[PDB]
Scaffold this active site. Structure first.
Site, PDB file in Angstrom:
ATOM      1  N   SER A 109      -0.725  15.401 -12.103  1.00  0.00           N
ATOM      2  CA  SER A 109      -0.800  15.364 -13.320  1.00  0.00           C
ATOM      3  C   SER A 109      -1.139  16.408 -14.301  1.00  0.00           C
ATOM      4  O   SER A 109      -1.681  17.494 -13.774  1.00  0.00           O
ATOM      5  CB  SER A 109      -1.912  14.335 -13.555  1.00  0.00           C
ATOM      6  OG  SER A 109      -2.557  14.048 -14.630  1.00  0.00           O
TER       7      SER A 109
ATOM      8  N   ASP B 245       0.590  -1.271  -0.063  1.00  0.00           N
ATOM      9  CA  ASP B 245      -0.157   0.170   0.175  1.00  0.00           C
ATOM     10  C   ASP B 245       0.841   1.380  -0.083  1.00  0.00           C
ATOM     11  O   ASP B 245       1.393   1.453   1.072  1.00  0.00           O
ATOM     12  CB  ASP B 245      -0.975  -0.083   1.400  1.00  0.00           C
ATOM     13  CG  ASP B 245      -1.884   1.119   1.359  1.00  0.00           C
ATOM     14  OD1 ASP B 245      -2.121   1.923   0.179  1.00  0.00           O
ATOM     15  OD2 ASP B 245      -2.500   1.346   2.391  1.00  0.00           O
TER      16      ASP B 245
END
Length: 330
Positions: free
Chosen positions: A199, A35
């Site tokens: 992004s 994770d």
């Protein structure tokens, strides 16, 4: 040193991925959910409340000659999906894919929430976010990666998740045969303890690319792609019959649909998520309403590039002094 381990989807939907991990002496192999959105290595154990164990493999520290109680240390964690676990702490030897750390904090669960109990395939979590998020008190502990780092050939790990197929986690090296083209690296902020990056935009299907900054985290422990409501609405508007259902808990679409791809930007590069990756199947057995793999982050408080996005790429988690993230197509 290096390590290399195969990671395998837990079910037919790629809801999560498990990776075998050797703990203790002699080795006890547990299948852990790696994770990158948390920083605790915790396991089902001989200390876990019996009624909360249903099929998991447990770590038994009393059977490990290298286990030592970390006296006074406790831990307690809550995840973004509302699940939780807590317990006490041992140090022991932990190996992943041939890479060994001695003195790793292995957090033994005394209690786990129902979602963990009900998932017989996940024996615990191995956190790979920054150690500043580790929950052990009163002495915070380091992640497996942080402990391994100085011994690694290169201070990196890579995630290469499969679509309905096994993939690979590598530690200490970049496998140049595992991706196509070049890797595009982008800056990381560690301010919130995550692999947080920005992004450069998105496209829906064959549509034009929208240049826009989307801050989010690379999170292997989250199944879906969670993005701003504007972006998500633009995606689902291209699927006839798709709608957001408060009763179901997100966007659903007719199972008869063909889903468009979704592209996200990494610098000047583009990663394309095929439409099929965005199909999470019937909302309940036999339903003709299917659950979407792109969902709104509104009310989460952060955008999450979960498995839906990451499995479309070869992803480098560069833990050098100035961390960065790299993405390549594959």
């Amino acid at each position: 040193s290096t390590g290399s381990a195969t990671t395998t989807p837990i079910d037919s939907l790629d809801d999560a991925y498990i990776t075998p991990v050797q703990i203790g002496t002699p080795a006890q192999t547990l299948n852990l959910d790696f994770d990158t959105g948390s920083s605790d290595l915790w396991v089902f154990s001989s200390e876990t409340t019996a009624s909360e164990v249903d099929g998991q493999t447990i770590y038994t520290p009393s059977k490990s000659t290298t286990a030592k109680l970390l006296s006074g240390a406790t831990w307690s964690i809550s995840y973004g999906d509302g699940s939780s676990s807590s317990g006490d702490v041992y140090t022991d030897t932990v190996s992943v894919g041939g890479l060994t750390v001695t003195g790793q904090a292995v957090e033994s669960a005394k209690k786990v929430s129902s979602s963990f109990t009900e998932d017989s395939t996940i024996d615990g979590l191995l956190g790979l976010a920054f150690s500043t998020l580790n929950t052990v008190s009163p002495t915070q502990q380091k992640t497996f990666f942080d402990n391994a780092k100085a011994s690694l050939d290169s201070p990196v790990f890579t995630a290469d998740l499969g679509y309905h197929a096994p993939g690979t986690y590598n530690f200490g090296f970049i496998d140049t045969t595992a991706y196509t083209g070049s890797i595009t690296y982008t800056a990381v902020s560690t301010k919130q303890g995550f692999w947080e990056w920005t992004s450069t935009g998105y496209a829906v299907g064959s549509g034009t690319f929208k240049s826009t900054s989307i801050d989010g985290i690379a999170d292997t422990g989250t199944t879906l792609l969670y993005l701003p409501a504007t972006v998500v609405s633009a995606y689902w508007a291209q699927v006839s019959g798709a709608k957001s259902s408060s009763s179901v808990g997100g966007y659903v679409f007719p199972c008869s649909a063909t889903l468009p791809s979704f592209t996200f930007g990494v610098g000047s590069a583009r990663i394309v998520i095929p439409g099929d990756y965005i199909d999470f199947g019937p909302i309940s057995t036999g339903s003709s309403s299917c659950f979407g793999g792109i969902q709104s982050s509104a009310g989460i408080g952060i955008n999450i590039f979960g498995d839906v996005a990451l499995k479309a790429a070869f992803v480098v988690f560069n833990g050098a002094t100035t961390p960065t993230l790299g993405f390549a197509s594959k």
